[PDB]
Symmetry: C2
Subunit: 292 residues, 2 copies
């Protein structure tokens, strides 16, 4: 088995694998990830929750921070109106198999002790170090220090997130006494190859087939290919690609690796791959769609 | 006339027109924020006199004691800073000020207030402001201070607040007081309101004060901002003898023509300055 390997699987980067190994040995450890409540939960989200579940299976206590305060300022609904969406999100994640504690940013991000720390942090952060991570607003340089403060406040051992905010985690290590292990998940490529290019975990078998069919997917090309990415990150192996007895016949790959190879040497054509991943994804998301 | 009284000895009044309007209202308020200071010098006293004008002009006065700001700049714990602050209050009352005092820490970490700091930062640019992040935040906290205290007038020094006159519903009138030059002419170089007569005379003597030069002359600045006229300036009968100036403009005239020598000016400024500060020092 190995908990380290399970946590590491399908991650872009783990900022200090050696620290994680030390953290895994602790009798008590915790990890968190932030999400702005969202009406639709797509595969990007699901990818990350699967990671939290890996950590959950390794003995970590999970904390999901629901960024309602930020959602309020970005001008989404009212606090109580966002809470409804948040609780919905809570249902989805629970359906995904996550067992976590949920905290709404508004519960603590306006507290005096927390606000006082933002100002302290700001006195030690350069406008450069902060802008790092068409007309710039002040909020942009504040946001990353609030995030560092969240890491301090929630007391976690591990902070999880996409590869995008990987520089926001450089500040934490720089500005807080306790060093936290950062875990970064890959960023999924939009269905078109680049807002309607997402597959929702609760989309219908019809919609999924539809969204998949029109999807970007050059034969031979794997990098930046949304369909391949799905197969690498959600599909179970081995899996068999149903095939015309004349078109080459059934293919039985036992790993994403093999699949990748077949796709590169063009043994497997775009269409044949799409139908496989499509019906395959549909089964994998099925158990979640029901409880929703 | 109240508009003139308020304009008196000010660098600039951002929209006299707006001020003129404010004065019409039956109720109006103005504030200035100070970071508690161990020693109150002529600089502070100059601004308090301005607050006193507004006071006499019917403005309710608010003194914002910047303790939180002090605290964040490692200037000591808060309770210790309130001690210095409470003192400053006594000195401003001894100067004749009648206002309500408020410590920043009492509201600057409140939810409503902090939530308002985040809204403002979402509409302010990282340019129309600006090196540490805090630098670009203070200007937003200030606009928020003006908003929170709900003042019609904000007094301060020459230091981007009409920025507030843009992202705020109520327009505020800004007033910027001139900044004093040091005794040596460059910016432990200042007279304190509570200084002893003998110390004042000492500080005056060594001060930068070129015969005929008025620009940047601290002795002339003291003459223009605190002395009263007609001013009586004694002088040995062999140096022109005693002369009585009825306005600051005449003083400039005399001094600029070397008709008034630095020594004689100093003795008059020092002796008069002393007689003015006394009623205060005689209360602390």
């Amino acid at each position: 088995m190995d908990e380290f390997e399970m946590i590491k699987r399908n991650t872009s980067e783990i900022i200090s694998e050696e620290e994680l190994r030390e953290v895994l040995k602790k009798d008590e450890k915790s990890a968190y990830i932030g999400f702005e409540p969202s009406g639709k939960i797509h595969l990007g989200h699901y990818l990350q929750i699967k990671k939290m579940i890996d950590l959950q299976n390794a003995g970590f206590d999970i904390i999901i921070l629901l960024a309602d305060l930020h959602a309020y300022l970005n001008q989404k609904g009212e606090l109580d109106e966002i809470r409804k969406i948040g609780d919905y999100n809570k249902k989805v994640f629970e359906a995904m198999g996550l067992k976590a504690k949920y905290v709404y940013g508004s519960e603590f991000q306006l507290d005096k002790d927390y606000t006082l720390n933002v100002y302290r942090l700001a006195l030690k952060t350069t406008l450069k170090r902060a802008r790092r991570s068409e007309n710039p607003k002040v909020a942009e340089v504040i946001y990353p220090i609030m995030q560092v403060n969240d890491i301090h406040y929630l007391g976690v051992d591990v902070a999880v997130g996409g590869m995008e905010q990987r520089k926001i985690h450089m500040l934490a290590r720089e500005l807080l006494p306790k060093k936290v292990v950062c875990i970064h998940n890959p960023v999924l490529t939009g269905l078109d190859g680049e807002k309607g290019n997402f597959i929702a975990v609760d989309d219908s078998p019809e919609e999924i087939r539809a969204k998949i069919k029109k999807a970007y997917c050059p034969a031979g090309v794997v990098e930046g290919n949304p369909i391949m990415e799905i197969a690498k990150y959600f599909l179970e192996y081995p899996l068999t690609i149903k095939r015309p007895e004349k078109f080459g016949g059934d293919l039985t790959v036992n790993s994403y690796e093999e699949l990748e190879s077949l796709f590169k040497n063009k043994e497997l054509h775009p269409m044949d791959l799409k139908n496989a991943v499509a019906e395959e994804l549909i089964k994998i998301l099925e158990p979640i769609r029901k409880r929703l």
